[PDB]
Amino acid sequence: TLFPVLNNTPVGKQVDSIYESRLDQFLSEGQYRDFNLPSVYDHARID
Amino acid sequence: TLFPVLNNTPVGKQVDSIYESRLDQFLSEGQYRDFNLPSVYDHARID
Amino acid sequence: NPSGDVNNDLSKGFVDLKVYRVPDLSRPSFNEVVGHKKFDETASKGDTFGPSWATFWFEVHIRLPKSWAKYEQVIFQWNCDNEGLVYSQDGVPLQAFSGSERTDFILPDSWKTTEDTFYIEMACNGMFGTGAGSQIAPPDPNRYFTLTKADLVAPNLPAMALAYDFLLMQQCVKQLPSNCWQKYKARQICNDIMNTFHPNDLSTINECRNLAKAFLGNDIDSEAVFEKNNDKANVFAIGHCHIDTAWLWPFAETRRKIVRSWATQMNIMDRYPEYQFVCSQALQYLWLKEDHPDVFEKLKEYVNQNKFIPIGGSWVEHDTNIPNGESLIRQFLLGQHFFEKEFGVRCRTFWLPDTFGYSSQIPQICRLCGMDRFLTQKLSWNNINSFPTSTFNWVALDGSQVICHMPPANTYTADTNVNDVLHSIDQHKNLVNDQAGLLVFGIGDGGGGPTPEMLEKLRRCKGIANTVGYLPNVKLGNTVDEFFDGILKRTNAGQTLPSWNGELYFEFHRGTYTTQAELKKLMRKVEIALHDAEYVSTLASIFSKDYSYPKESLQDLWRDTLLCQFHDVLPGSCIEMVYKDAIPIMSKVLKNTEALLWQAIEQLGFKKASSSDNKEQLCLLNTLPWNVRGVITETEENKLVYFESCDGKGILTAAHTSLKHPAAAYQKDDNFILVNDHLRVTIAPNGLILSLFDLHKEREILDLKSGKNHAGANQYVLFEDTPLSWQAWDTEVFSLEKYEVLDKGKVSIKESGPLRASVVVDIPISELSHMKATISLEGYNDCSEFTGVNFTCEVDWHESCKFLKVEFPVDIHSEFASYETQFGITKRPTHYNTSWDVAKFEVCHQKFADYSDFTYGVSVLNDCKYGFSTHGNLMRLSLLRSPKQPDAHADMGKHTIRYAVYPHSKPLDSSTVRAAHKFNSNFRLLTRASDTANLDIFDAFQLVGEPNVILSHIKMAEKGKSIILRVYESLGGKSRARLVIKSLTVASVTKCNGLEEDLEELCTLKSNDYYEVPIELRAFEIATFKVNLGFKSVACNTCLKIIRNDSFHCTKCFDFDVCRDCYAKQAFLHPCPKPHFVLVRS
Amino acid sequence: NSFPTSTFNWVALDGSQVICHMPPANTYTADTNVNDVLHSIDQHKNLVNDQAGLLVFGIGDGGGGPTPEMLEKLRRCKGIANTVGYLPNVKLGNTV
Amino acid sequence: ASYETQFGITKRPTHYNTSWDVAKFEVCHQKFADYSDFTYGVSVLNDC
Amino acid sequence: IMNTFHPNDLSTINECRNLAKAFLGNDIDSEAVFEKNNDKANVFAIGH
Ligand SMILES: [Zn+2]
Ligand SMILES: [Zn+2]
Ligand SMILES: [Zn+2]
């Protein structure tokens, strides 16, 4: 079987509001822009 | 002061549903009739 | 019509009923009635039959009119508002009847042409007994039932198909959201069906069905609906019939309910090829096999066809709070052995949808007994906190985990309406982790399972999902184990599921810890007696050449014991007749266990004391796996004798010397003092313990200054119980707000002697209710034989809706209390902070409840009680309840309650555990039968090492002649010990599982005369060791070892891999009746 | 007063009738978000008569119409409806 | 687990059972955090 | 009122009524209740 006998790593049930509002920062161009998708939109813009 | 320093008697917050449905048996003429108000309605009914 | 209405014409058919009435309330079998009794009295529609629980047999002779040569289906309708069970002429059960919910019996196309007869075994009780006004009210013994239908029918099949179509569409109209377009599509189609149907034109039925096809699709008429979109199902439907082995009916009625449910389900399986049905309890299979062997043969064929899936793996669907740990292991051992013997199946899902609470070590016992899945729905009855998740990992105290699912539609008796199918996915509580719900449909809580109407509705729900696609994709042809396989596959073997660590607390039915006190006391006594009997039987079979281990007698005793642990009998929520059955068979188990133990003892060279031999040669049997250095026991009616043992632990000999630390009872300024070397107990003339002073640590233990209790410990309080709905099941949190303190007692000195000092309190509970409390202190030689202040209450209990408890304020400050539960400790809060803690106002414990701070603690030991409450320095033991609703005389009568207050100068440690075991022990007076065979072999199996490791059980293996030793860590730390096997030649010692299948081989040393296998246990581990005597990331699903070499993977399922050694052993049974194993390398 | 229907027959004084539809998502400048696609069918006012809604998307009230982003979102809404099937089945290649 | 706090010990859960325990994924302690079973334990001491 | 009432003690009835006075006032036993705030009634009751 793949189901381990021993569980020493508790997993919490996800809080709905926290994990739903986490979704907003993947495409946000705000404070965490450098760690999320908008940082790789461009391929070296020139102006 | 009357407020005691030490509290060794925890008091729980009352569950709304349980304590609201407890209210129904004070005037109920059912299983607990003998322990509640309907037991003392009469003063020796005669028939 | 009867045949008397048709004499001139041999063409218009009839129904003739001859009724035979069983004289007593007995339940004769088919062969004891048909062919022997006379069916003479004639019955007709409108007749009335029998008092409650009465049995009537009907010979039904039918003649179909020849105008019914057409009408490809002919129905016999039977509606007497009670139980059915059509019997064929050859005695074959064919079809059950249950009031109006199940009335039709399809004539089997073989005796429609021939004017044939059959039989109906009517039982004069409802699906849930009689009831007397309410379902759970005490049975009405004078109920009478009226026959309202005994008709032959030739149903219009297209009309009934249209009725099912319209019912599903109308439910979609009523249930779907008001902005859902499928709701209005359904309403539009239903309206056209009404505008189209004319009762005078039968083709309108067919065009109405064609109209409904726009909503249900074209495949609803067969099992082809489920073959579409069958790869992304969200709801998995499985048929189920929960038959309570005894809830509101005797065991004898359960025997008939089993057969009439399963024969019905088997004929339904014949008609519906996609339908699958799970039933759990192995004892019910055994009962069917005893009563109807041919039905059992047919059943095992169905099990082979993967219809009729046996599940659960336990003997009965038992309570998991009250029985001790060995009882839970025995449930699994007996159930799994029965299922492996009768079928080729080993259950992998623990099925327990109706048990009141789940103890913290159930996942470990499940993993030890081969089950890694858990199904349950009872936690939906939590009336304070909704359980956070529907699918999760449930982790035991030791860390062992099962994967648990709670069917989101909070029932195991669903109806397959669109609301049930919808709720099976949309009230799933942790849908972000998995989007699969189990739909458990049928009629249960004691009775007969799903109807063909429910399968039609399921087919139409699937068709709706296929066609207009708002209902969930529902799958019908999958087993419960395949459902769990899907969950494990989607969740990375369950790694992403939320965890729950410890006990699953049921915030309901707490009064079940205390109600039926006699049965619970008997259960504990019987468990301890069975342990002792198996221990001495193992010793006698090992050391006596002419004694065979009584496997058969022990198996019978365990079957009865495990039967009484059923999740409604043991918690104390049955009608009075159930206990009029259960208490005598429990007493018989106790008596026969004692007889077995005495046979083994006689084989070992001893005999019962017989009260004629002189005291100096009296011995005492210990059976605890450690030296109880001294025991004080009565020999005559009032003579106390001290038995000591210096080295050998099994046998204690009567002591000559006086005690080093005698106990004394004297008087003071109207106060009574029970004094020891260790404790000073100051008892008011009221009977309240004014002071409990530890003499070594010169500290008071009580703290009467803070808290609500200011007048003594051991305070008896009578609370007004009056629960909300279920009197025998429930106690409410508001029950503590209204009470009477029993403080009118009188104290007298019962004894003051050196062995045991003791006072007697005579407490008037009320009129009609009295109690006599004895408070005793024992002297000792060593502090390890002390059990604290002992209390024996003799209660004449005749109260109504009262709850007698005893309180001890204890000068301990801690945020948690330790409660001994099966194979370990559960920690419960003492503070009521959140609603989770508010819900735990009364909790279940096995034999002690400990309340300790860093420097001191107080344990309350008991020998018959299971309800405790520790909240803020107040320890309260629940003593007696007086419920009335299922049983009007539940606990009325005499009760002996023993409990001890054991103060100790540290946090909870092994001294409390040993004191609780000793407090619960039955030390038996023995006499050497001779002096040539009086050897003390009672130390053959010892456990030496950390005292928190308990050798809890010694047994002989079911299969061979090996000895099974159950060992467990009791206090929660990784510990080291050694098994010492002294007077024996040990071929080998292996670590095995709960089913006694070898897991690994252990290194056994060889000392001067013993063997000394060193063992290491994890924090709360339950280990099993098999001693064979004589001279001689994929893990295997039998031995839970990582498979490094080639493995064997079962293709029939998803997560069963066996190693090469276990494959050669043929140890690969699992929920696959016909397993196919492919070889896997590397 | 909310108008009773989304799809109806509008009859003149003389009795001449046209068939009128009012896009249930109450705009002609929708954005093709999942809310617009959902509302195009689920706030239809007489769904018992017909279960078809028109989604009129673009930027208007004087200006320039739909953007390619809206067409990408429409394709993904259709894909969601095809795959997990809660969003309505949306069609793009049909004329009014 | 036992966390030293001002003038004593606060016990926090280690299991994430309910949302109360889920909320305590990081906790405050003064100078040591202790994780002990019945027979053994490990303290993590710190100075900042 | 429930915690106070005992069917074996009839004075508990009177003290339960005294407890209820905190919610119903003191005039409910006669027609004097209607003589208070009787100028701004919102509901007018008539038997029928
Ligand atoms: Zn049940
Ligand atoms: Zn398999
Ligand atoms: Zn193996």
Residue C526: its H or E element: helix C517-543
Of F1, F2, F7, the CB nearest to B40: F7
Residues of C annotated as catalytic (active site), given as ranges: 354
Count of all residues that appear for chain A in the document? 47
Ranges assigned E (strand) in C263-322: 277-279, 309-310
- Give C-chain residues touching E20 at CB under 8 angstroms: 834, 836
Contact partners, residue B35, CB within 8 Å, separation at least 6: C720, C722, C801, F7
Contact assessment for residue C919 and residue C837, using Cβ atoms and an 8 Å cutoff: no
Reduced to 3 states, what is the DSSP secondary structure of residue C1029?
strand
Please tell me the distance from the alpha carbon of residue C803 to that of residue C805, in angstroms, as a whole number.
Answer: 6
Cβ-in-10-Å burial (0-12, 13-18, 19+) of F43 comes to exposed
**Does F45 touch chain B if contact means CB atoms closer than 8 Å?**
no
Token pair of C1038 as six digits: 């039998």
Q: Which ligand is nearest to the CA of C1056?
A: 2
CATH number, domain containing residue C793: 2.70.98.30
Tell me the nearest-neighbour CA distance from B43 into chain F, angstroms: 11
Of C500, C973, C1019, the CB nearest to E17: C500
**Does A11 touch chain E if contact means CB atoms closer than 8 Å?**
yes
Token pair of E47 as six digits: 């100075």
For C551-608, the DSSP string reads: HHHHHHHHHHHHHTTBTTTTTT-S-HHHHHHHHHHHHHHHHHHHHHHHHHHHHHTEEE
The alpha carbon torsion through C270, C273, C276, C279 (nearest 10 deg) reads 10
Contact assessment for residue C207 and residue C451, using Cβ atoms and an 8 Å cutoff: no
Nearest 5°: the CA angle C957, C958, C963 is: 10
Contact partners, residue C78, CB within 8 Å, separation at least 6: C84, C86, C97, C103, C105, C120, C149, C150
Which residue of chain D has the CA closest to C184? D48
Chains near C with 3+ CB pairs less than 8 A apart are A, B, D, E, F
Cβ-in-10-Å burial (0-12, 13-18, 19+) of C431 comes to middle
Please tell me the distance from the alpha carbon of residue C723 to that of residue C708, in angstroms, as a whole number.
Answer: 24
Contact assessment for residue C964 and residue C1026, using Cβ atoms and an 8 Å cutoff: yes
Q: How many CA atoms lie within 13 A of C175 on its CB side?
A: 16
Please tell me the distance from the alpha carbon of residue D46 to that of residue D4, in angstroms, as a whole number.
Answer: 7
- Give C-chain residues touching E4 at CB under 8 angstroms: none
The CA-atom distances, in angstroms, between C68 and each of C64, C75, C87, C150 are: 7, 12, 23, 18
CATH number, domain containing residue C475: 3.20.110.10
Please tell me the distance from the alpha carbon of residue C389 to that of residue C500, in angstroms, as a whole number.
Answer: 9
> What DSSP character marks residue C52?
T
Nearest 5°: the CA angle C736, C740, C744 is: 145
Contact partners, residue C886, CB within 8 Å, separation at least 6: C136, C137, C138, C248, C573, C574, C575, C576, C727, C728
Sign, CA dihedral C502-C505-C510-C515, equals negative
Query: Which of A11, A13, A18, A19 best probes binding to E when mutated, by most E CB atoms within 10 angstroms?
Result: A13
Please tell me the distance from the alpha carbon of residue A45 to that of residue A39, in angstroms, as a whole number.
Answer: 12
Contact assessment for residue C761 and residue C741, using Cβ atoms and an 8 Å cutoff: no
Of F1, F7, F13, the CB nearest to B35: F7
Q: How many CA atoms lie within 13 A of C1048 on its CB side?
A: 17
Binary contact (A11, C389; C-beta < 8 A) = no
Distance C530 CA to ligand 1 centre (A): 27
Residue C3 Cα to chain centre, angstroms? 51
Please tell me the distance from the alpha carbon of residue C65 to that of residue C3, in angstroms, as a whole number.
Answer: 12
Sign, CA dihedral C807-C811-C815-C817, equals negative
Please tell me the distance from the alpha carbon of residue C309 to that of residue C707, in angstroms, as a whole number.
Answer: 55
Ranges assigned E (strand) in C467-558: 474-475, 499-501
**Does C737 touch chain F if contact means CB atoms closer than 8 Å?**
yes
Tell me the nearest-neighbour CA distance from A27 into chain C, angstroms: 21
**Does C1033 touch chain A if contact means CB atoms closer than 8 Å?**
yes
Q: Each residue of E5-15: b (16+ CB within 10 Å) or e?
A: eeeeeeeebee
Token pair of B47 as six digits: 């028939």
Which C-chain residues 350-409 have CB contacts (< 8 A) with chain A? 367, 372, 388-389, 392-393, 395, 398-401, 403
Terminal CA-CA length for chain B: 59
The CA-atom distances, in angstroms, between C12 and each of C1, C117, C755, E23 are: 9, 17, 91, 77
Which residues of C participate in the annotated binding site? 242, 244, 354, 567, 1036, 1039, 1050, 1053, 1059, 1062, 1070, 1076
Token pair of C729 as six digits: 């099941």
Binary contact (B32, C873; C-beta < 8 A) = no
Binary contact (E39, C948; C-beta < 8 A) = yes
Contact partners, residue C1002, CB within 8 Å, separation at least 6: C988, C989, C990, C991, C1013, C1015, C1025
Please tell me the distance from the alpha carbon of residue C823 to that of residue D25, in angstroms, as a whole number.
Answer: 62
Token pair of C758 as six digits: 């003791």
Of D42, D48, D49, the CB nearest to C179: D42
Q: How many CA atoms lie within 13 A of C636 on its CB side?
A: 6
- Give C-chain residues touching D25 at CB under 8 angstroms: none
Structural domain range at position C823? 664-920
Strands C401-405 and C117-123: unpaired
Experiment used for this model = cryo-EM
Token pair of F13 as six digits: 């009835």
Distance C351 CA to ligand 2 centre (A): 18
Binary contact (C501, A10; C-beta < 8 A) = yes
Binary contact (E15, A10; C-beta < 8 A) = yes
Contact assessment for residue C661 and residue C678, using Cβ atoms and an 8 Å cutoff: yes
Overall resolution, Å: 2.4
**Maximum separation of any 2 CA atoms in chain B, in Å:** 60
Contact assessment for residue C305 and residue C479, using Cβ atoms and an 8 Å cutoff: no
Distance C1047 CA to ligand 2 centre (A): 14
Which residue of chain F has the CA closest to C737? F3
Strands C104-106 and C941-945: unpaired
* Cβ pairs bridging A and E (under 8 Å): 14
Which of C723, C857, C687 has its CA nearest to residue C803?
C723
Residue C96 Cα to chain centre, angstroms? 27
CB neighbourhood size of C610 (10 A): 8
Nearest 5°: the CA angle C986, C990, C992 is: 140
Which of C724, C730, C786 has its CA nearest to residue C756?
C786
